[PDB]
Write an enzyme that holds these catalytic residues in place. Structure first.
Site, PDB file in Angstrom:
ATOM      1  N   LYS B 232      -5.535  27.815  42.567  1.00 40.00           N
ATOM      2  CA  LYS B 232      -4.974  28.856  41.718  1.00 40.00           C
ATOM      3  C   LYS B 232      -6.018  29.256  40.675  1.00 40.00           C
ATOM      4  O   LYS B 232      -6.700  28.411  40.102  1.00 40.00           O
ATOM      5  CB  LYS B 232      -3.681  28.358  41.070  1.00 40.00           C
ATOM      6  N   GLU B 307      18.018  29.305  45.567  1.00 35.88           N
ATOM      7  CA  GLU B 307      19.177  29.838  44.866  1.00 35.88           C
ATOM      8  C   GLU B 307      20.470  29.354  45.493  1.00 35.88           C
ATOM      9  O   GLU B 307      21.421  29.029  44.777  1.00 35.88           O
ATOM     10  CB  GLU B 307      19.152  31.373  44.862  1.00 35.88           C
ATOM     11  N   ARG B 335      20.822  36.382  46.358  1.00 33.49           N
ATOM     12  CA  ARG B 335      20.624  35.448  47.460  1.00 33.49           C
ATOM     13  C   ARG B 335      21.575  34.242  47.444  1.00 33.49           C
ATOM     14  O   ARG B 335      21.608  33.478  48.418  1.00 33.49           O
ATOM     15  CB  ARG B 335      19.176  34.967  47.450  1.00 33.49           C
TER      16      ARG B 335
END
Ligand SMILES: [Ca+2]
Ligand SMILES: [Ca+2]
Ligand SMILES: [Ca+2]
Ligand SMILES: [Ca+2]
Ligand SMILES: [Cl-]
Ligand SMILES: [Mg+2]
Ligand SMILES: [Mg+2]
Ligand SMILES: [Mg+2]
Ligand SMILES: [Mg+2]
Ligand code: NA
Ligand code: NA
Lengths: 560, 557
Positions: B232, B307, B335
């Site tokens: 990253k 979720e 979702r």
């Protein structure tokens, strides 16, 4: 040697031991050697009582021995047992103070179709939709660990329910928090290394009909710590030869018309696929219910059963459409709730050419409110780009399926379980004009704006009142020109839909009247803001005022 | 490597690599120098516009290798989430358009089919790439086209259920496709078991090893899975040292956020109630559970990008008498709709939903818009549905929803508020009652949420009544009945779709009682609002003071 039955008892079998095991505590007063005799008896009683009421059949027979062993080894109800889906929980109910209430099973005011928290303290989680048991049981175990309560948490989940993404999320998370819980895979269709990788302790496979092995294994795992995974192998329909042989037909039975709307859809899917090689057929594990049966035999290369994976079904459809194919997603209204993000984000936001054939729209009857198709008009029509359609009979279903299919963008066609008024069906495949209703009766004073299959009841009511009746066809886009005309020529508009009134098709009319300052009185009929208890569909419709009697009363009461 | 270039770097190789076709005319020995040039350009342009930063630095080399080896656009490349696709855009005819990025009428935040033939699938939500690439691959086979299908997915995205569903199905159909796991938490058995041919892990910044591996796998058959490992922020030390901080940046050269009002409330309520549990599907920083996770680590649950499990996990916790709070953005709660309905509302279980990013969200655009939660929640029986108008109301309505025994939702936007004082008490308010903020003559503005301040500026001009409705469900029916009789026009205002929204809750009530007053519904329109600054999107929608006044004056005439 086990025996196998080929016939269902018509008379209450003699179950003297089952009757001493009316609750888990009484069951645990019995001796291990009696348990296999108890199993034979429970099996016999199960066949008998389902033959009396109808209901789910084969899955319960598969878990007779497993259910006995669980309530014998675990201190239920203090220990928490979560059944996934719950169609296999008739044995459970039989052992948890409901044996003699089974005769009320799936009737108005009788035992519900699935375990239900309000029904019994032995039911830890209302189920119906699949693959929720691991998540729910993890929640219970996390809470019990924090409270210091020292209870067990057990989830029994079928191999099918394990195909759902939410089951994978729960297995991952349970490993994360090193929860003390037991997942039993009830597998009836190198198993181990997957679950070890996901951080579970894997045991099995073992024979799910061998009560001695089951009891000893569970005894050992009961007090093991951390995430435990027990792999059990069962035979669907076990002990009843017809069910063993044909587990699909014996998934459920009835107690010992025109075409079904699902059959009208299935025939449409075949007919259009014969005309159009682009058509693809997708179902999240409901081939028989949505009725892609003939389609999957004739067009096997174009049929996709994605398992219990609603979410992937819809995004898969989006990708196929990206290449110019024409996917049809067959999905019940209640199960589409689980793919709403894929429908909005992957289909609608991109305006992709995907048809949603939404079966089981409206009240569904005995399966009750866990399976109600009460909301799809409300949750779809707010979504930009969606064509939203409500056919009123078999002919209209075929025509609106063609219309949404050919429409260049996302479309929804909703219809109920069961059969229709049995009107003639045009064999051709042509669409109808998008956004235009059909006037089915010219009257005066009152206008019934009908979205869907209550049209025939509204026609009865219109006769007494000399009402106008419109077959609206489209929730979105609305036939605004027709509503505008009716609003100026009538003294009352009456909307009728088998969907929640809140946010529903009638409120699209209400929204239109407001935007143009049209002052006409509006009466919205539809499903009320509560969960309608299981009964016969006709009983549930009457409750909600959606038969001719209820509609007439509501219109009459407004005008007086 | 230490400073964002403030002047355009020299990139003679990159300027010869404006399209993948031109990229593929370069020599492998040029590609390391291209990547250095691509990284400095990426640094430069995102410093001028703002945007996502760290993830794209991580896929400079991977993007070059993919477009070098695969015959794009005919071969289908699908980027999961898409915040890492700025290299991809730089190499697909948009380099010289990158100065418009995330600005009105400029490049979108994410790959977007309408934007470029090089974007196969509009993304924003995570974990969709595998499903989409699989449908493309099935289509290509049925069509007898020989194109490749490649999905690039991060390690976080793989925690979502739908990605597991797609891996299993891809194996079931024996699809010819390649999944590349872009693993930047640094790293096989699992994927082999699921039916996939696993290769790796390999160094995602070793361009020679990348090009060679991808070439080999490019023509293998069946489900192929390549594990690459990336850093990253690679190549920019500030970002490698603080990847959370450099996930996104603002371009170079006053009140608390609402999410921080929520986060202060969560801590305060948890200090009072040992039963409170805080759940987030991988948005600790965004929903702002940071202090909560530090002070109450045993009562804080990050379920990853999950979720669905979040909501049913809460339902289980509520079954044992604990008090879960589900922190979730409106767009992402889409979702878990089924778990909210089936597991929570049908059982009337005691779960609070703290719904952030409600309304328009600005530059991320329509894939992240919180446009629908009032419409999709208020049709669900049992739901308490609330719309705070400022900081103090957010705190009050969270306490109201939390004390309620049952399912409750409180929606609030990204960003900050009007910065009104905040009562430090934790007291509820009466369920189902609005608050008149101003009494006026001829119009009544019934405001659901944060447009109240704008409505208040307009109420002066018109001498209007203004009500802070607080509740969509249950509606303050008596107050609406009174306003209907004493005003010539009711106006409803909400940062939600008009179709099915709180305005429509008012309309349903009026129609059911035969109250014939005129009703103007203001809110979000029935299309996807294009990315722009929040103030520009709200202006487009008529939800600023000027747009509210124009709308009202028009109707009265
Ligand atoms: Ca199948
Ligand atoms: Ca017809
Ligand atoms: Ca494409
Ligand atoms: Ca503090
Ligand atoms: Cl209402
Ligand atoms: Mg199974
Ligand atoms: Mg009819
Ligand atoms: Mg990552
Ligand atoms: Mg509460
Ligand atoms: Na014809
Ligand atoms: Na930042």
């Amino acid at each position: 040697m086990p025996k196998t039955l080929h016939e269902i008892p018509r008379e209450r079998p003699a179950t003297p031991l089952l009757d001493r095991a009316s609750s888990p505590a009484e069951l645990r007063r019995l001796g291990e050697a009696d348990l296999e005799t108890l199993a034979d008896e429970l099996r016999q009683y199960l066949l008998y009582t389902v033959g009396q009421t109808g209901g789910h059949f084969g899955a319960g027979l598969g878990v007779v021995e497993l259910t006995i062993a669980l309530h014998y080894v675990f201190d239920t109800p203090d220990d928490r047992l979560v059944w996934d889906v719950g169609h296999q929980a008739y044995p459970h109910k039989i052992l948890t103070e409901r044996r003699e209430l089974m005769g009320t099973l799936r009737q108005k005011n009788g035992l519900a179709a699935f375990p239900r928290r309000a029904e019994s303290e032995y039911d830890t989680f209302g189920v119906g939709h699949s693959s929720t048991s691991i998540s729910a049981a993890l929640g219970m175990a996390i809470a019990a660990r924090l409270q210091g309560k020292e209870r067990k948490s057990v989830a029994v989940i079928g191999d099918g329910a394990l195909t759902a993404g939410m089951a994978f999320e729960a297995l991952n998370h349970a490993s994360e928090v090193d929860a003390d819980m037991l997942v039993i895979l009830n597998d009836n269709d190198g198993p181990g290394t997957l679950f070890e990788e996901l951080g579970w302790n894997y045991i099995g496979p073992i024979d799910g009909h061998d009560l001695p092995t089951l009891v000893a294994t569970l005894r050992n795992m009961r007090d093991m710590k951390g995430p435990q995974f027990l792999h059990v192998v069962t035979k669907k329909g076990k002990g009843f030869a017809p069910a063993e042989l044909d587990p699909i037909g014996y998934h459920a039975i009835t107690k010992l018309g025109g075409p079904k709307y699902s059959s009208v859809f299935g025939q449409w899917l075949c007919d259009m696929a014969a005309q159009d090689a682009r058509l693809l057929g997708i179902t999240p594990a409901m081939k028989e219910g949505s009725d892609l049966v003939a389609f999957s035999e004739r067009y096997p290369e174009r049929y996709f059963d994605v398992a219990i994976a609603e979410q992937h079904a819809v995004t898969l459809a989006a990708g196929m459409a990206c290449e110019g194919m024409k996917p049809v997603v067959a999905i019940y209204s209640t199960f589409l709730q689980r793919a709403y993000d894929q429908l909005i984000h992957d289909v609608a936001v991109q305006h992709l050419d995907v048809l949603f054939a939404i079966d089981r729209a409206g009240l569904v009857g005995e399966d009750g409110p866990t399976h109600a198709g009460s909301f799809d008009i409300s949750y779809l029509r707010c979504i930009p780009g969606m064509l939203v359609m409500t056919p009123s009979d078999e002919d209209e279903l075929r025509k609106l399926l063609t219309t949404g299919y050919l429409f260049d963008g996302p479309a929804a066609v909703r219809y109920p379980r069961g059969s229709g008024p049995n009107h003639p069906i045009d064999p051709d495949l042509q669409p109808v004009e998008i956004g235009k209703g059909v006037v089915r009766r010219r009257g005066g004073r009152v206008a019934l704006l009908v979205f869907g299959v209550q049209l025939a009841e509204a026609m009865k009511v219109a006769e007494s009142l000399d009402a106008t009746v419109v077959d609206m066809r489209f929730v979105k886009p609305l036939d605004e020109a027709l509503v505008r005309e009716l609003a100026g020529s009538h003294e009352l508009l009456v909307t009728i839909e088998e969907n929640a009134v809140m946010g529903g098709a009638g409120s699209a009319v209400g929204e239109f009247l407001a935007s143009e300052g049209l002052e006409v009185p509006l009466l919205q009929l539809g499903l009320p803001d509560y969960y309608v208890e299981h009964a016969k569909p006709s009983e549930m419709l009457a409750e909600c005022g959606l038969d001719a009697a209820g509609i007439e009363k509501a219109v009459r009461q407004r005008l007086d």
